[PDB]
Amino acid sequence: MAGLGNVTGAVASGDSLTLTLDNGTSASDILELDVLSEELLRVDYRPSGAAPSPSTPMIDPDASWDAVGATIDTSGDPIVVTTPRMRIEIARTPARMTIKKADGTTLLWEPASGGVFEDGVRFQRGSTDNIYGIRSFNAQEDVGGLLRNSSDHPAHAGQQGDAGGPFMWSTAGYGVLVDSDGGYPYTDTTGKLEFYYGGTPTEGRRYTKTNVEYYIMVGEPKEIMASYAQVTGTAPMLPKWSLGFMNFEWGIDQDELEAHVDGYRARNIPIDAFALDYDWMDYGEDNYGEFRWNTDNFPDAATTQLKEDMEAEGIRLIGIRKPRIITRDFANQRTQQYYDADSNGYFYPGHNEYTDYFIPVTVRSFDPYQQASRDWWWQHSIDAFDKGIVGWWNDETDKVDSGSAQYWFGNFSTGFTSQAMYDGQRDYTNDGVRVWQTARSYYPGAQRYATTLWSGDIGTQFYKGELFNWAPGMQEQPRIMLSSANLGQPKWGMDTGGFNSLGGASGPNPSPELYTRWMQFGAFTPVFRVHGNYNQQRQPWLYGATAEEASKAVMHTRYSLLPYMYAYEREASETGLGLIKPLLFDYPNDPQAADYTEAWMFGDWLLVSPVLGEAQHSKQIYLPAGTWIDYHRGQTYSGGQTIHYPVNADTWTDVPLFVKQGAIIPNQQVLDYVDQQSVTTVNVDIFPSASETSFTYYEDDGSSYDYESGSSFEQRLAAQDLSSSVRVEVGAGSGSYTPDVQHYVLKIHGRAGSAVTAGGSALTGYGDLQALQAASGSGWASGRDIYGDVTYVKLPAASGSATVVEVSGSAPSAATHAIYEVEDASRSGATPTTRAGINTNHSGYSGSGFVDKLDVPGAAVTVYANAPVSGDYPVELRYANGSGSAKTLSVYVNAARVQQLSLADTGAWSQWGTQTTTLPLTAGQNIITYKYDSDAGDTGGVNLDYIRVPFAPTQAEYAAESAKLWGGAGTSQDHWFYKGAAFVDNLTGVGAEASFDVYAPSAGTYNLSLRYANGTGSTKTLSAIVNGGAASTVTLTSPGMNWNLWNEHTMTATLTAGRNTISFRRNSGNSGNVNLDRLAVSASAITTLASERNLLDNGDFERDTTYNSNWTQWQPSGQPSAFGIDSGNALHPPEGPARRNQRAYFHSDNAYQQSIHQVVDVPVNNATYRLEAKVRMKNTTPTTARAEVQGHGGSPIYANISNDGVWKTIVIDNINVTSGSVDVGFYVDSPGYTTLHIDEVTLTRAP
């Protein structure tokens, strides 16, 4: 903010004066004065004499003046420039300009304190001078006058009729013009006249200048304005017709235009032009519609006829133009104009796609408060109801928001709108079709008219402020749901996936992660629904195989629970209490339940706590008083504590779900929809408590209000754990509805009885659940499941009298495996009529049948199998192959392709064999799929009978990142070659630790293997603490100064049956400073885990793209990279990953070559390896697109990728590695607009 220094040199030449100014350096400042006319001076200040920047488009590039012949006198102090109209004085010490009229009258001057400087100009002038220019006023502003005597408004073009610029002038005889892209003029009534470049203005700044170029005008206003036009340009003459009257109009076609023109002409009212708004053009359409005449409105503009006919009537035509293009037509297709603009870089910088509206309609709110209004509303809805609208999604019964229209609906508007449909539909159908509605507000009483509540236009984000601050996201929704429950509206839902994004409907869809977690959450809420903004899609398969399979899996859980859930729908008709409730309902006196919203009750007997955090590796879950059983993993927890709950961030398969001891949970086979068939057997899972508990099973027609006059069915089920037996009562049937249920299968957990009695009779024992299910009439059986010992009891439902069953004794099963009959499992395929099938037409099968039709591409069967801990499970597949030769099927686990199974001929279709494969299962639910994947080279063509899954793994694994971290230990992805989603780092402070919860079947000595990195260069130590016992030293050598190298530390530990704690901690004697990845646990020697076969780093591209990986890239010198990694969720529709959250892409709009490569040293040289990957190609066919294996000892091996649009598996087998390393890669040569996606790349040791 300092002024210029002393003049140290002055060089006159013609009409120019060049001053050198002292700034205390060898690169002195330069001030160039040029006398352009007798009354116009140009000044160019160049800090340190640097070359001037280009002038902005303010300046006329062709401006030209005659020689003035000014007198420049540098002989004294001040230096003096004179013309007949002005006298410019520059004082030497320091340099300050004074501008005067030729007669010596002072106009303006640079004050002592400072004039021109690096960021602007500063003048002083008469305090009473009137200043003009700078700014005008827009159509949304208070409109001031002409005077600018106390102004700090910026210089800008502005909006809505505004005008402005760096031009300040006075009627006292001077003007100042500064070349600038925006900036900040300043005036006040002490006499300041200043202009600052300042910070980037609101409108942006695309022309920056290091010099300060300005112009000083002397004269009367007309002379000042003429000088302004000399500098910035005069105006070209408009056509003479433009002095005439013009009629601008919006809402006009050719007939109306002709009528208007006739109207003027008939009346001798002169007029020269009509201006046509949107009407004239095909705005919204492809092929440059926003430049094309709309021949529906103006038929004669198909040719020059309209122009010529209007010209003959003396009418010229003006057309509205918007500085934008339509990037999606009315059918949601990318337009030609989009492709052209996008490929050439013609979009305004910083301006993304957005939603416009240009077709107005006029509307007015109806009043639902009036009975006659409600009758009318209903009467006009009957036709839509008859033709299929059987649920009413009543939107915007709350508030209008449109321009000046900001109207509120009253508090009873939702209730009354709901009443209109409720009363109407009930009368019209004679109470024969139940009403379903949703609204986005609730007020007491509205519930009488059969309406749910949804949470409105929530944001597509994890939480409020993650991506934008103006709407809450997923994490807030439990608090909204439970607040609604606390107001007596438990029938609640949300837009799963979110509605709003940055950029409106064109903004991004949820990431696959956000989508998957939101679906798991929504499945345990009352009104389970996806929604999105205009032309957004929310189908689960669009978000990749994890989202698809995890969403499917949790939906199967929800539908299996239909009989459980439906009792709560009945309960809401009696007490208003519904399917969800906050913990505080059950625990009014528990302070940790008082505000608790991260978990809630789903019915009376299940506590759910969905994983809602991005990249979440574990959860802290408050369990209130009682005993809780993990639904998916089987272990028990005592209540009244916060538990640490490991989750697998790699698979997304966990939905933390806990059975409340006392639970009686009716459940059934999974249907595609609620009345797809009659369910004649209802399972009842019972977890007995020492106090009696009960659940009243309920059926009715699901459809009418017949239940109101007694047409329903119920049976009270009750249970109690006694000193040495369990008693279960199935009460007498009650009510007039004949239920579909014929038998209950009681699954009584916690005891495998030696006898089951009822009414003086010991029930007939059967060998297993299958034999019991096949028996007519009552019986029992026993077994083992994930929870432990279980007793099965099959009984008739709907008896007129109560049945009391008692399970006594203890005779635990010796079974080592669970059996899953695949005919009971999930059958899918490419189309609804090409799904895998059920059959019985060959003998020798277990259970009720086997699965066939695995001989059309895409046919599959999926089993949901629970595991107590993560690890290796050898899973046996029973199958038949009477084809004459071996056949292949893919086995997928948690959406990853684990192996191609080669299934040998079994000699005949009625002869069965078994294939056992070690599967990497995760703790809790696992998704095991056997599929005919023709695009991976499978043949299909076998029949499958069942799988057998061991209750215990051969060896277990526990991820460090999911362990309980303390003392500064954290998770990270900032080094290479970790397993799972992350590793543990920052074991630096004393007390830093990772504590694992390890499960053992029996007391004894177990082997441990701890995967760790130590890149310090020297041996480091931690302590191992088992079950809080004495610390033992863990000594961890360093393989060198490289944090991408991992090793195993082996040791043993003495464990007890059940849960053990094993902590690795920096105690005060220890050095720490290692990273931990995984703890493996076995009774035998530990070998490579099935989950850890992949030799590549970041082969699945799942790493946060802030962090790098062992992948490298290449493109031709001079070409921009065509490669990146993201989720594909910004696209409409999404182009998702093959698995989990992310995939690599190659894409450019113009011709390109691109590769990525990764080199790894193999563990065993002179051995065979195998590359597998998922690849998808779309859009333009490239010249070359391939996977590549090279550097292995042999010549390059190629596998081509062909343009389809679908994910395919590419395999390069039999890689004979003799060099000790392999380069795997992907390469594309494209003429332009080829998209390749790459995901799930694995390099493994192959037999």
Ligand X SMILES: OC[C@H]1O[C@H](O[C@H]2[C@H](O)[C@@H](O)[C@@H](O[C@H]3[C@H](O)[C@@H](O)[C@@H](O[C@H]4[C@H](O)[C@@H](O)[C@@H](O[C@H]5[C@H](O)[C@@H](O)[C@@H](O)O[C@@H]5CO)O[C@@H]4CO)O[C@@H]3CO)O[C@@H]2CO)[C@H](O)[C@@H](O)[C@@H]1O
Ligand Y SMILES: OC[C@H]1O[C@H](O[C@H]2[C@H](O)[C@@H](O)[C@@H](O[C@H]3[C@H](O)[C@@H](O)[C@@H](O[C@H]4[C@H](O)[C@@H](O)[C@@H](O)O[C@@H]4CO)O[C@@H]3CO)O[C@@H]2CO)[C@H](O)[C@@H](O)[C@@H]1O
Ligand Z SMILES: OC[C@H]1O[C@H](O)[C@H](O)[C@@H](O)[C@@H]1O
Ligand U SMILES: OC[C@H]1O[C@H](OC[C@H]2O[C@H](O)[C@H](O)[C@@H](O)[C@@H]2O)[C@H](O)[C@@H](O)[C@@H]1O
Ligand V SMILES: OC[C@H]1O[C@H](OC[C@H]2O[C@H](O[C@H]3[C@H](O)[C@@H](O)[C@@H](O[C@H]4[C@H](O)[C@@H](O)[C@H](O)O[C@@H]4CO)O[C@@H]3CO)[C@H](O)[C@@H](O)[C@@H]2O)[C@H](O)[C@@H](O)[C@@H]1O
Ligand W SMILES: OC[C@H]1O[C@@H](O)[C@H](O)[C@@H](O)[C@@H]1O
Binding-site residues for Ca(2+) sit at 821, 823, 846, 849, 945, 961, 979, 982, 1077, 1100, 1102, 1139, 1142, 1239-1240
Check: CB of residue 816 under 8 Å from CB of residue 951: yes
Check: CB of residue 391 under 8 Å from CB of residue 437: yes
Identify the residue among 27, 1131, 1164, 1167 touching ligand V (CB under 6 A): 1131
Give the C-alpha distances (Å, rounded to integers) separating 510 from 532, 548, 1064, 1133: 10, 14, 38, 12
Contacting Ni ion within 145-174 (CB under 5 A): 158, 162
Which entry of its own copies, ligand X, Ni ion, none binds 424, CB below 5 to 8 A by partner kind? none
Helix pair 545-560, 562-575: axis angle to 10 deg: 60
Q: In whole angstroms, how close is the CB of 895 to ligand V at the nearest point?
A: 19
Contacting its own copies within 339-368 (CB under 8 A): 340-341, 344-368
| Secondary structure (3-state) at 1197 | strand
Catalytic residue status for 253: no
Scanning the structure block, which residue is given the tokens 């439906």? 566
Q: With binding defined as CB under 6 A, does residue 1018 bind ligand Y?
A: no
Judged by CB under 6 A, the stretch of 562-570, 885-893, 1039-1047, 1196-1204 that binds ligand Y is 1039-1047
Q: Which residues contact 98 (CB under 8 A, 6 or more apart)?
A: 78, 88, 89, 90, 91, 106, 108, 109, 110
Q: How far apart are CA 247 and CA 275, in angstroms?
A: 6
What residues form the annotated binding site?
A: 119, 249, 251, 256, 282, 285, 342, 537, 620, 644, 821, 823, 846, 849, 945, 961, 974-975, 979, 982, 1077, 1100, 1102, 1139, 1142, 1149, 1229, 1239-1240
**DSSP-assigned states of every residue in 596-625:** --SSEEETTTEEE----STT--EEEEEE-S
**DSSP-assigned states of every residue in 245-262:** -EEEESS--HHHHHHHHH
Q: With binding defined as CB under 6 A, does residue 396 bind ligand W?
A: yes
Q: How far apart are CA 927 and CA 735, in angstroms?
A: 41
Give the nearer residue to Mg ion in terms of CB position, either 252 or 482: 252
Which entry of its own copies, ligand Z, ligand W, none binds 142, CB below 5 to 8 A by partner kind? its own copies
Q: Which two tokens stand for residue 965?
A: 């971290």
Identify the residue among 988, 1061, 1115, 1119 touching ligand Z (CB under 6 A): 988
Q: Which among 296, 356, 395, 427 is annotated as catalytic?
A: 395
Q: With binding defined as CB under 6 A, does residue 199 bind ligand Y?
A: yes
Give the nearer residue to ligand U in terms of CB position, either 837 or 1136: 837
Q: With binding defined as CB under 8 A, does residue 573 bind its own copies?
A: yes
Backbone angles phi, psi at 478, to 5 degrees: -60, -35
Q: In whole angstroms, how close is the CB of 649 to ligand V at the nearest point?
A: 22
Q: How far apart are CA 131 and CA 174, in angstroms?
A: 10
Check: CB of residue 512 under 8 Å from CB of residue 1129: yes
Catalytic residue status for 457: yes
Contacting ligand V within 1140-1159 (CB under 6 A): 1145, 1147-1149
Torsion of CA 950, 955, 958, 959, to 10 degrees: -110
Give the nearer residue to ligand Y in terms of CB position, either 1040 or 1231: 1040
Contacting its own copies within 1040-1099 (CB under 8 A): none
Give the nearer residue to ligand Z in terms of CB position, either 653 or 1014: 1014
Residue in the shown chain whose Cβ atom is closest to Mg ion: 251
Q: Measuring CA to CA, which residue among 421, 417, 472 is closest to residue 443?
A: 417
Q: In whole angstroms, how close is the CB of 196 to ligand Y at the nearest point?
A: 4
Q: In whole angstroms, how close is the CB of 248 to ligand W at the nearest point?
A: 7
Identify the residue among 4, 7, 10, 15 touching Mg ion (CB under 5 A): 15
Q: With binding defined as CB under 6 A, does residue 204 bind ligand Y?
A: no
Q: With binding defined as CB under 5 A, does residue 617 bind Ca ion?
A: no
Contacting its own copies within 416-445 (CB under 8 A): 416-417, 422, 433-436, 438, 440-445
Q: Measuring CA to CA, which residue among 581, 751, 604 is closest to residue 663?
A: 604
Which entry of its own copies, ligand U, ligand Y, none binds 855, CB below 5 to 8 A by partner kind? ligand U
The contact mask relative to Mg ion for 233-262 (x = CB under 5 A, - = no) is: ------------------xx-----x----
Q: In whole angstroms, how close is the CB of 479 to ligand Y at the nearest point?
A: 23
Binding site for ligand U (CB under 6 A): 842, 852-853, 855, 909, 941, 943
Q: With binding defined as CB under 8 A, does residue 538 bind its own copies?
A: yes
Sequence-separated contacts (24+) of 101-107 with Cβ below 8 Å: 101/173, 101/218, 105/173, 107/172, 107/173, 107/174, 107/218
The residues that bridge with 1052 in the sheet, in sequence order, are 1007
Q: Which among 375, 398, 423, 740 is annotated as catalytic?
A: 398
Give the nearer residue to its own copies in terms of CB position, either 541 or 637: 541
Buried b or exposed e, range 468-491, using 16+ CB within 10 angstroms = beebbbbbbbbebbbebbeebbbb
The contact mask relative to its own copies for 190-219 (x = CB under 8 A, - = no) is: ------------xxxxxx------------
Q: In whole angstroms, how close is the CB of 895 to ligand Y at the nearest point?
A: 28
Cα separation of the two ends of the chain: 76
Q: Measuring CA to CA, which residue among 462, 424, 835 is closest to residue 614?
A: 462
Judged by CB under 5 A, the stretch of 861-869, 1079-1087, 1098-1106, 1195-1203 that binds Ca ion is 1098-1106
Give the nearer residue to Ni ion in terms of CB position, either 398 or 586: 398
Q: In whole angstroms, how close is the CB of 153 to Ni ion at the nearest point?
A: 6
Q: In whole angstroms, how close is the CB of 988 to ligand Z at the nearest point?
A: 5
Catalytic residue status for 855: no
Q: How far apart are CA 1211 and CA 346, in angstroms?
A: 41
Q: Measuring CA to CA, which residue among 1012, 988, 863 is closest to residue 930?
A: 863
Active site residues: 395, 398, 457
